[PDB]
Design a binder for this molecule. Structure first.
Ligand SMILES: [Cl-]
Ligand SMILES: [Cl-]
Ligand SMILES: [Cl-]
Ligand SMILES: [Cl-]
Length: 192
């Protein structure tokens, strides 16, 4: 009466390792962790669309040799790129960023496949910023057997996009609890 949707995504025998690792985390932090690949990606400025498609395509081909950990992500620096496992019908865990506007959802046709682009401009870190300075993009490429994997990218906003920021009217509306617990799991696989 609480976890039906999550349970659908943990049916795989390789998703058994992910499930076992999540159950090792205190219940209160299970909703707070990202399932993030142990790469790490080199940081990058805003990526051209063909680069996004190649990065997700290569990740999908390398998946059996890439491990994941449940981890907290908080106030990642500009340039940060992550490969994450996430159900599209579940909310993203927190990253410490708040937004003065709604995330916009665009779809592109790429070589006959759909690339989803979830672009959240007007990002800010309320503990340290009074104006917006950051963009977060979440990408996924559909119909190539990698539907629940995302590229998540944080980068610097343009000066002209910067607007005054106030947590009282931002999304999400609540500041996360600091300091963060240490909760990073040992690595596991999502395909064998
Ligand atoms: Cl475990
Ligand atoms: Cl808006
Ligand atoms: Cl998938
Ligand atoms: Cl929200």
């Amino acid at each position: 009466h609480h976890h039906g949707t999550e349970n659908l995504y943990f049916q795989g025998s390789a998703a058994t390792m992910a499930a076992q690792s999540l159950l090792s985390i205190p219940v209160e932090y299970r909703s707070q962790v990202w399932c993030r690949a142990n790469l790490p990606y080199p940081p990058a400025p805003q990526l051209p669309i063909p680069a996004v498609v190649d990065i997700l395509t290569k990740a999908s081909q390398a998946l059996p040799q890439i491990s994941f950990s449940w981890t907290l992500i908080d106030q990642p620096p500009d340039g940060s790129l992550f490969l994450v496992w996430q159900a599209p019908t579940l909310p993203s865990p927190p990253d410490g960023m708040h937004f003065m506007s709604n995330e916009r959802f665009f779809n592109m046709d790429v070589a006959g496949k759909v690339l989803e682009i979830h672009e959240a401009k007007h990002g800010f870190y309320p503990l340290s910023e009074t104006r917006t300075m950051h963009v977060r993009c979440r990408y996924r490429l559909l119909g190539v057997g990698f539907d629940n994997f995302w590229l998540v990218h944080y980068f610097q906003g343009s000066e002209t996009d910067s607007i005054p920021a106030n947590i009282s009217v931002a999304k999400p509306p609540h500041l996360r609890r600091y300091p963060l617990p240490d909760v990073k799991t040992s690595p596991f696989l999502l395909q064998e």
